Amino acid sequence: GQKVHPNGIRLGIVKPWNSTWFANTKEFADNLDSDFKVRQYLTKELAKASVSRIVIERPAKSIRVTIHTARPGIVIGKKGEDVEKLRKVVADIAGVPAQINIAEVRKPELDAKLVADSITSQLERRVMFRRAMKRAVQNAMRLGAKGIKVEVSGRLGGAEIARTEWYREGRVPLHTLRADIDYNTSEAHTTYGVIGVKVWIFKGEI
Amino acid sequence: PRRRVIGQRKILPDPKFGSELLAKFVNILMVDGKKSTAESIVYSALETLAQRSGKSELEAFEVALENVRPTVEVKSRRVGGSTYQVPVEVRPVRRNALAMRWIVEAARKRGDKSMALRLANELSDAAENKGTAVKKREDVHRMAEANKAFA
Amino acid sequence: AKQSMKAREVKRVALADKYFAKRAELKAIISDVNASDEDRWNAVLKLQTLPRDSSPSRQRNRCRQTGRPHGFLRKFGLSRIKVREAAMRGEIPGLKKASW
Amino acid sequence: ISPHVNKDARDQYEIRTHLRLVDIVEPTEKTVDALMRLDLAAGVDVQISL
RNA sequence: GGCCGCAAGGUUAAAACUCAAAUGAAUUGACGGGGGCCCGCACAAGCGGUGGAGCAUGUGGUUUAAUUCGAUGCAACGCGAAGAACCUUACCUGGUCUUGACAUCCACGGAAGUUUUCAGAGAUGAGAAUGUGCCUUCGGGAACCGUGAGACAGGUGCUGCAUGGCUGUCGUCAGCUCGUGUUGUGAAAUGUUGGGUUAAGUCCCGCAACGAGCGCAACCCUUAUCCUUUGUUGCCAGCGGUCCGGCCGGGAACUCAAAGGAGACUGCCAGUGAUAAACUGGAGGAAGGUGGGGAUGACGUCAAGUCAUCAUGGCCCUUACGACCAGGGCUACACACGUGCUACAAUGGCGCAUACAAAGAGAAGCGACCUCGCGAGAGCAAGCGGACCUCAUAAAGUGCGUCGUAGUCCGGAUUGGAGUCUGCAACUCGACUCCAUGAAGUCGGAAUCGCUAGUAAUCGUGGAUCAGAAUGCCACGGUGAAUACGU
């Protein structure tokens, strides 16, 4: 059958939101549109800085954006010359005062989004999909996780009939609501069509 | 069902008198969740029936029922490709249920002016051993008797 | 949707913003009782020379991300599909699956 | 929840809003200054009436 | 052809031609008008419907210039559509444009308010007024309107049998697998079978098996009983004022509001059972054995649905399959099917007059009091971003009269005249009001559907889409049943 989104089913129990503000009915829509444009711009611009999460807050009449990344040096640059440009453009798009903060991801091998992005990048340069998946699983289990699952679907290897494959190791209990499961996805554009990737990571009960 | 046991529901007695039998009768008469109308009809009928026979309403009702209570009936069986009527005994609860149901069905088909009048007429005729209710009892008993060989 | 439909929408909104007050004045003239009875005729004849696209009722709500003319919600500015996508990703403050 | 025909198969969502009311009976100049010179979280909406 | 026999026939015994296989014994499934055990509104026991009539709505067919495209046994047919008069619109007839209605490049000059003629309009022509900001070291041109040439833009065009993402169904069924060990030449097997038990591959005990994973249960929301905090806009037993009304002074006790907590565990008693797992009874308690209702969908099956939400490989058109504009069509009508609403009446129709709810929405918005109109409505105007104002009067019910079984004082299709409102604009093709007209139909052939308790049946109330347009969809409470012997 079909499955429910793990993040969604867990919001409010063990998972936090990605946007924290109050508003009324005459500003709700405009706030959402502005957030969408800010995220689009930042994701396009920092495409090689290993970004995984953008958290937005709207106090008073200002916007403050926190970027979670695993390569803060590339984002910050030579004494802030790049963070300043980012702040200027974001303030122009939001229409109000803007502030930017940077937070660091210690272990990239236990973050779902970065693993998927890596697998997609490899597939685009003609690597073997089995090799990519096995490497991902091995690294995850080595660095201290309690379980991992990886899934890949499409015209694997140039075939004419599509297909789906997956690998698993450890534990991944999806019906338990107090389990801490990280989930995310990515897409690869090859010379034969689109290929899709999904990654599940388990870390313990809370 | 297959693996179930079902208990008995409690039933409140009537307010005017204190009988659960009359409550079951009112329940069997009601339609579409209108209990007050059914209570009115039943009470009017018993009032108009008490005078005709010079006895209490409960006694008149019991006398009417004792001539429609059935004893044996026929079930259908088919294991050899043919349908047979098999006679079985009836138990007291089912006796009462069938009696009341037949009385009300017979009343509804009459041709007087009001439901209370029709019910009173049917109850009096049953006490006198006439009407469709007694006819139904007799027919069922005949069908039970005609098939004693299959017991 | 196609690229021309959104262009139509933008043009409509612009003209409807441009011509707002004139219409209000003319409609006050026609609606108000004890008028000259000839100013009424002239105003009725004049309200039909303004461009058609200037009436607010020629506008159609569309999703702000795709352009879909069906299945629109007003609190969010989007259609059902994109509402669900954002909601599961966690981008709508306060929203979660409900039971009772 | 389907891009085409299927007419059952729906999803139901909810948003909740919590509300609180606080009364101050005898304000003074220092109190009003202290209140107006405060800052709170970015998900709380505050309205002050005299 | 020979030999034998009365005959029926027996015995010895070839070739042409044609195919790439025919065959034995075991292994995993699926199937049986084979056997054994067990479940589900599956039957049985009951209550109300559909199939007949009139109307609303979707589909096939036929018609037309066009009647835009998609969904097709269960699992398509009030489905994508949570709302086609123009717009939406993707369709038809006619008038128009060619670097283009929507973006990036270069270089030649300048920008928005009002107002006149010709067009159905798109779109051509006359005019009047203005000189923005800003290192002007003169090069700023950012901002935003013009024309000119070519790299390009554009496609609701084809393939869901090239795809990503999303969904239906078997099925909320109890199953589906792995590592190491052992057995067999091998495909494979064991574990997962057996004796008991449960809603459950739930649990115990045995056994060449020993252990783990995805599913089952539990942690999440709601409902029912309690105590501690804080009492306005919500609440009034005691106290005291009276124009009677929580009005006023007051009180923190009660309803109630929303944050922390307690409680239910086969925990206790008796009996049966393998000195087990469990099962049938009882005590207290608001609630007893999964207390009631939700969310939660295993490995896989159907080349199942969607290139017309979106994204994408390959193909196809570029003065045209891309633009813009007014009129029409998606609402047709010999006919066939699915899903619904109103009835065919005295458990009722009509007139008077009187109790008792719940959950919601509101600034280009919800509209009280008052006056005018028979009425839909109109004028003038408080309050409310709301436990405060407004929408807003619940209906079935109870009490008193009339109708007396009639195609009726039951039913309310169709048609004639006169009006109200939204909107530039109601002919094709909107909702509602007043006067008049008063059709079919007296409980529906062969078939066939829903439901196990606050359930079926019946009565009213609200919201999303939305200028306006629900008998559909999603939510809320009032009255309140019949039956289950059994497989």
Site of tokens 């017991």: B151
Q: Does A43 contact strand E, using a CB cutoff of 7 Å?
A: no
What are the DSSP E strand ranges found in B3-108? 72-77, 84-89
> What whole-number distance in Å separates Cα of residue A116 and Cα of residue A133?
10
Question: Strand, coil or helix: what is B76?
Answer: strand
Say which CATH superfamily domain B20-147 falls into: Ribosomal protein S7/S5 (1.10.455.10)
CB-defined contacts C:D, below 8 A: 22
**Resolution in angstrom units:** 2.2
Contact C75 A21 (CB under 8 A): no
Closest-CA residue to B122 (of B53, B58, B49): B49
As a whole number of angstroms, the distance between CA A38 and CA D38 comes to 29
Sign, Cα dihedral of B44, B49, B55, B60:
negative
Q: What does the alpha-carbon distance between residue A147 and residue B26 come to, in Å, rounded to a whole number?
A: 66
Is nucleic acid strand E under 7 Å from A22's C-beta?
no
On whether the CB atoms of residues A68 and A101 are closer than 8 A, the answer is no
Which helix (H) or strand (E) is A9 found in, with range?
helix A6-10
Tell me, yes or no, if D45 comes closer than 8 A to chain C by beta carbon: no
String of b and e for A110-135 (b: at least 16 CB within 10 Å)? bbbbbbbbbbbebbeeeeebeebbee
Q: Which nucleotides of E are covered by protein (CB under 7 A)?
A: 38-43, 46-48, 70-71, 76-83, 86-89, 101-102, 113-114, 122, 154-156, 162-171, 213-222, 232-233, 258-259, 293-298, 300-301, 303, 305-306, 309-314, 322-326, 346-348, 362-364, 378-379, 385, 387, 396-398, 404-405, 423-425, 453, 456-458, 464-467, 474-476, 478-487
Residue given tokens 């007419």 in the structure block: D7
Those residues whose C-beta lies under 8 Å from the C-beta of residue C48, and which sit 6 or more positions away, are none
- DSSP category for residue A168: E
Q: Note whether residue C99 is domain-resident.
A: no
User: Which positions 52-71 on chain C have a beta carbon less than 7 angstroms from any atom of strand E?
Assistant: 52, 55-61, 63, 66-71
d(CA A86, CA A43): 12
Query: Is strand E in 7 Å reach of the CB of C96?
Result: no
Nearest-5° angle of CA A14, CA A19, CA A20? Answer: 85
Q: Which domain holds residue C32?
A: 1-90
Residues on chain C touching A28 (C-beta within 8 angstroms):
75-77
At A63, phi and psi to the nearest 5? -125, 130
Q: Is residue C24 included in any domain, yes or no?
A: yes
Are the C-beta atoms of A165 and A151 separated by less than 8 Å?
A: yes
Cβ–Cβ < 8 Å for B129, B68: no
**Residue B27 CB contacts under 8 Å (≥ 6 apart), including other chains:** B11
CA–CA dist A130, C50 (Å, integer): 67
Give how far Cα B43 sits from Cα of A117, A188, B38, D41, Å.
82, 82, 9, 71
Q: Rg (Cα) of chain A, in Å, rounded? A: 19
Q: Which residue is nearest to the C1' sugar atom of E71, using CA?
A: D5
The CA distance from B62 to B51, in Å, is: 16
CA neighbours within 13 Å on the CB side: how many for C97? 14
Does C86 fall in a domain? Answer: yes
Q: What residues contact residue A33 under an 8 Å CB cut-off, 6+ apart?
A: C64, C77
Evaluate if the CB of C33 falls below 7 Å from strand E. Answer: yes
Residue D27 CA and nucleotide E246 C1' are separated, in Å, by 30
Q: How far is the CA of D1 from the C1' of E309 (A)?
A: 12
Parallel/antiparallel/unpaired status of strands C72-73 and B84-89:
unpaired
CB A198 within 8 A of CB A205: no
- Distance in Å, residue D25 CA to nucleotide E247 C1': 25
Task: Break chain B into its structural domains and give their ranges.
Answer: 20-147
C94 chain-D contacts, CB cut-off 8 A: 15-17
**In the complex, which nucleotide's C1' lies nearest to the CA atom of residue B11?**
E481
Experimental technique: cryo-EM
The per-residue DSSP string of A120-132 comes to HHHHHTT--HHHH
8 A C-beta contact, residue A136 and residue A165: no
The count of domains in chain C is 1
- Please report, for residues A86, A88, C62, C66, D3, the alpha-carbon distance to residue C3 in angstroms, rounded to integers and kept in the order given: 30, 30, 13, 11, 22
Token pair, residue D16, equals 């909740």
